[PDB]
Amino acid sequence: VLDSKVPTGPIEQRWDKHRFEMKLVNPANRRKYTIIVVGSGLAGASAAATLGEAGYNVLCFCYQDSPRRAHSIAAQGGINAAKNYRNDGDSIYRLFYDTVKGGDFRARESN
C-alpha cells in the first residue's frame, strides 16, 4: 500500500507544518552521511549543490562530458513563479489552481 505522507490541515501551511514535523540532521552529523545523486540537470545539480552546502558527502553522476550538458540546458521557455510582479492577479493559490486544473486533476494537491 502507498503512503503519500501528505500533511493535514490547511493546504497553505502544510509544507511548513511538515518542515517542522520532519526530523533534522545536525550539521556536525551531516559529514557522516553519503548521498548519491544520479543526474546533474536542474533537479540533480540543484540537489547536489544544496546537499553539499548542507555538509553531506554527495556523489553526483551524469553520462555526459560535463554536468552542464544535461537536457535542462535546452529549455527555451521561462520559469514560472507566483510573485505577482505584474499586478495581474497572480498568487501562490492561483498558480496551484492553474497547475491542478492544467494537470487535469490527476496529481496530489499538497505537492
Place this chain on the structure above:
Amino acid sequence: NLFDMYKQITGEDPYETPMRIYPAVHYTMGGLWVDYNLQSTIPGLFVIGEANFSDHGANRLGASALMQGLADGYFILPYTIANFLAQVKPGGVSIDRPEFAEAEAEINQRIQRLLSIRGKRTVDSFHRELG
C-alpha cells in the same frame, strides 16, 4: 530567432515558403511514484525532477518542469532527505556486500550478452521500430 533557426535547420526561408512542422513526444510526467517526501517505494531512494510522477498530473503546464526540478533540488529534497537520514544510522553498508556483487555480476552479464549477440540489425534500427 525561430525563422532563422528553421532556415538553418531546413534551408528554407519561412518568410516565403510555408514552414513544415510535425508533432513529437516532448515530456514524460510519469515516472517513479514518490510521496510528499519525494521518496519512492524503495526506502532511501528519492526521485526528483522529470524522473518521478510527482505533481504535473496528466498534463505539465509550461515553465513548470524547470520550476519543479529547481524546487525539488533546492527547497524540498534537502528537508525530506534529512528527515530520512536522521532516522537511520550513517554508514554500515560497504560495496563489499553480496548485493553489490550480485548487481555487478548482473550488469557484467548483460553487457557481455549485448556485445556477444552480433546480429544483423543495428541498435537504432530496433529503437526506430520501437518508437
Place this chain on the structure above:
Amino acid sequence: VLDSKVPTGPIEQRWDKHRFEMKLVNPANRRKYTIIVVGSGLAGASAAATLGEAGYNVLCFCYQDSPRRAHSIAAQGGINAAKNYRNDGDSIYRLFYDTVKGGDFRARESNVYRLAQVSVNIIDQCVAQGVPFAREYGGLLDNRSFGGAQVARTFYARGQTGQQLLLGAYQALSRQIAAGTVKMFPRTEMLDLVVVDGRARGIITRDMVTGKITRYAADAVVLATGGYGNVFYLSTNAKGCNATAIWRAHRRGAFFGNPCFTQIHPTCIPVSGEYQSKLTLMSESLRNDGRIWVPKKKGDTRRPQDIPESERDYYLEERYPSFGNLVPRDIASRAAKQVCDEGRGVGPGGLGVYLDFADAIKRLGRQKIAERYGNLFDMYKQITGEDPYETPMRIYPAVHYTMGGLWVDYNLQSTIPGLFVIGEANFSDHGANRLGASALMQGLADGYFILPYTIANFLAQVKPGGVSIDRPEFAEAEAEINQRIQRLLSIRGKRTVDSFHRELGKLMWDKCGMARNAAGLREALQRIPEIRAEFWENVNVPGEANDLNQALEKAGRVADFLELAELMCLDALHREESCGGHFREEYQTPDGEALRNDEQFSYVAAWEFTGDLAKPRLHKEPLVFEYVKPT
C-alpha cells in the same frame, strides 16, 4: 495574585494582537514622559536607544566608565534567529519549540514565541546598525550551529559577537545622547528604588567618583541590570556584576521569579589561588574533541603527559558509559565538582580536571585542531602559561547565567507598576535552562521590539509628571541609603569584603550550586544568616563615602548578595524537582538527568519580600502548555 497578561488566540498572532490592543503615546506626548533605564548592556542600551528615538526623556545609568563596558560585551557565541537562511528546517515555531523544550517546560509559552518571532527583526536591525557579522564569499550572511539546536541559526561576528551587538546598541545610544533624548550617567550605581503611590517613580543612585547620592524621578523605571551569578564568588561574570538593583526592587515589592534557576558553564579556566574570582569560560565545543580525566593517585607530582593511560582516571568514560565523552554539561560538571571535592590537586588549589587533546591531536590533524580551537588554545596559554597541544588543559565548572530574576508579565512589568525588568535581570522566558545564543537575543528583543510597546501601553494610562524628588519617599530612601553606607564604612572589622564574598560564594557553590539536596540546602539556610551577621559586625570597608571607594561598592554588592543567597537557597529547597539547571539529587533519572514533577511544580515561583529574609511569601504562577507538550 500574579497576572501574566498573556494574549489569547493562536500563539502565532498573540503578540500582534497584543500590539494592537495596547495603548499608545502620541509622539508629541512622549516628550512629557521621563523613563529611567538602569543598565546599559544589550537590553539597557537597546531599550534606551529605542525610547530616545521614540521621543521620550530617558535617564540611562551604569556603574562602568562607559555604557560599552557593560557585560554582554564578553559574549563570545553568536545570536540566534529563526531566519532559515541555511535552508535546514529552521522556523519561528521551531525556535519557539526549541526554547520551550530547552528550558525544561518552565517558562510561559507566549513569551518564548514572541522572542522567537522578533529574533528576525533583531538580526535585521543589527545588520542595519553595521554589526560586522560573518559573511560568505558571495556577500550574504553566514550561519553556524549552536548547542541545543540541530539547525544553523546562529549569527556571529568572529568570536566576539556580543561585543559587536553591544557596540551597535551603544552606537544607537550614543546617537540618542547626541540627539539629547537620552541622558547617560556612567559610573553611577542605583542603590534604591523609590516607589510613590505604588508606582516605581524614581531611583536613588550614588556617583562612584564623587560619592554623591542623587535622587532621580521618572514616570517609569526599567531595570536592565543583568544577572546575579556573582552571588557565587567564582563565576564567569564581570567583577562588577551584582544583584543590587533587582534586590532593592524586590525589597520594594517586586517578586523574585525562580531565583534558584542558575546556569553553569562546563569549560572555564580554573583559578590560580584564593585571590582569583573570575573564571574565563571556553566554548563547550572544546569538549567535543577532548577527554576529561584526573590522575588515579591524588599525590601525583609527575607531569600529566608523563602519566600512563592505565594510571589515569578517565571519569565520564568509566562513569556514564552511555553518552561518553559528550555527557551533558550538568552531569559532567557535577562529576567534575565531586572529583575536585574528593581531593586530587591537579591544579594550584586542586579545583580542576584535565581536558586533554593528545588523543584528538594524534587522531586528527593538528592543523585542523588549530583551525578549530586556535584562539581558545592561545588564550589558554596566555592565561595559564601552558600549551594545550602538549600539556592537558585544566578546566573547572563555574556559574555563568541566572535564568531567574524579577518576575515580569507579558508586558515585561514586575509586580511594582511602572517597574520594567528586561534582559537577564528578569525571569521571563528562559525557563529552567537558557539555550545558547538566547540571552543576547532576549536582551535585544526586550530592548528594541517589546519594551517600546509595553512601556508606551503603561505610560498612556497615566498622566506625565506629578512626582518630584522632593517627595517624602525619595527622602526616606535617600536616608536609608546614607545610613547603610555610613554603617558599612563604620564597622571597621577585621575581614575584608572579598573574604565574606568568597565564603558566601563557596557555601552557595557547595550547597546551592549544581548538586542540591534537602540537607545541604538546610545547612546553607542556617549558615547564610550567620555569614550576614558576621559581615555586618566584622567587615573592613576603608575609605570615605565621598570618594572613589571601590571597597564601598563591593561592600554594598556583597551586602545585597548575602540576603539574595538566602532566597535562592529557600527557592531551591522549595522546588522538590529537577529541571534544567536546577538539579535536586533526590529527583533524578538513573542516568543522572533531571526528573521533573509537572503535576506539582509546573509553575513559576515568584517570591515576595515580607520583611523577613527567612520567610518570603511564595506565589505560584501556573504554567499551561498548549503548543509544546511536556515530555
Place this chain on the structure above:
Amino acid sequence: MKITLKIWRQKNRNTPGEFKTYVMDNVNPDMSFLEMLDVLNEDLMSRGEEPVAFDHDCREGICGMCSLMINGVAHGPKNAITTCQLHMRSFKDGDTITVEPWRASAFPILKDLVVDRSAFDRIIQAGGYISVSTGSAPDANTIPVSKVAADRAMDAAACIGCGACVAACPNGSAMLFTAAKVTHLALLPQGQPERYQRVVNMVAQADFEGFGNCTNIGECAAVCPKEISLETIAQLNRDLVMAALRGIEPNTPIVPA
C-alpha cells in the same frame, strides 16, 4: 616571586600624585597583574592603608576598562593583550614594575590609576554610528557585504575603547580609536550615507576633546590589544581628504553633559 611596585597614587583630580613603593614577597607566576594588584589591595586594607584604585570589569580583554601603563608600556610589556590578560609570568623575581594611569589631557585622572575616558564616548557621539532607527531596517540579506570588507570592518570594529592608543601616542592622540571606528563604519554599505560627514565630525570631536595630532609614529598600533592596524588611520585620512574635496564641514561639537 618577589616583586617591587612603584604605583601612582593620586587622591583625586586636583590633588597632586606621587609614586608609592610596595613590596610583594610572594607573587604567583600564574597570578594575573590585576590579581596581584588585588592581593596588594587586600594587604593594604589589612594594614590600614588606602587600597589602589584601578578600572576593571571583564578581566578578559574585551570590555576595555582595564587601563594601566606598566613599565612604560600600555597594558604591560606583552603586546596584543590588555592589562587584565597580562600575568606575572611575564616578569622576573626582584623586578621593579612602575604602574601608571593613562596620561592625557583628555583622560583626566580621577584616582590612583583611574582615568576619565568619556572623551571617547563623545567622539563616538559625534557621528560614530549609523543613523538607523529601530523598526526601519530591511531584511538582513538585502545588501551584500563582501567577506573581505566584512573581515576588515570586523578587524577595525574589534576595538575595546581602552584608550591605550592615546596613552602610548607621544602626542596623546585618539587617532587609532577614531580611525578604527571610521574604518569599521566606512567599510560597510550601511555606513556609506554618512561616512564623509562622520569622519569629519569625529576628527573634529577628537580635536575638541583635547587630543593631540598624528605624526604617524605608530605606538598606538604597537600597544593596541586588538592589533588594530595603521591602515585604519590611512583609511580615515582618505575619508577626510575626500570629505574636504566635497566641502564637508564639521557639525557642532558634542559638549559634555
Place this chain on the structure above:
Amino acid sequence: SVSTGSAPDANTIPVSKVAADRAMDAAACIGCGACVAACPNGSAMLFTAAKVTHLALLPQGQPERYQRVVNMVAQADFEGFGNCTNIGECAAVCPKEISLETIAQLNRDLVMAALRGIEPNTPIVPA
C-alpha cells in the same frame, strides 16, 4: 558564492537592462571549447572571459569578482591552456558570437585585481 535559502527578494537589487543584456550575451556560452580549438595558442581566454564578464556585469558578482578573475585566469594557466595574443579566431568560431569585449573586460578586471594585490588561490587539482 550564494547558498540556498539566503537569497533576498528577486527585485531587491536592480540590474540595468543594458548590463543584464551584456551579461546574458556573455553568459550564453555552451562550453564547447571551440575557442580553445581555434585559438592558435590553444587558449581558454574566450570561455574564461565570457564567464568573468557574465558574473562581473551583475551586482551579485561584485563581492568576489576581482578574486574570481585571478583565480579563473590562474586555473586556465594551471590546466595547460595557452596565452592570448589578441588574434580573434576564438570569436570567429564561437557558436554564440561571444565578442572580444569579454576578453577586454577580463583584462580590465585582472589589471584592477593586480592593483589591489589579489593573489590567486590554490588551483583546482583534478579528482
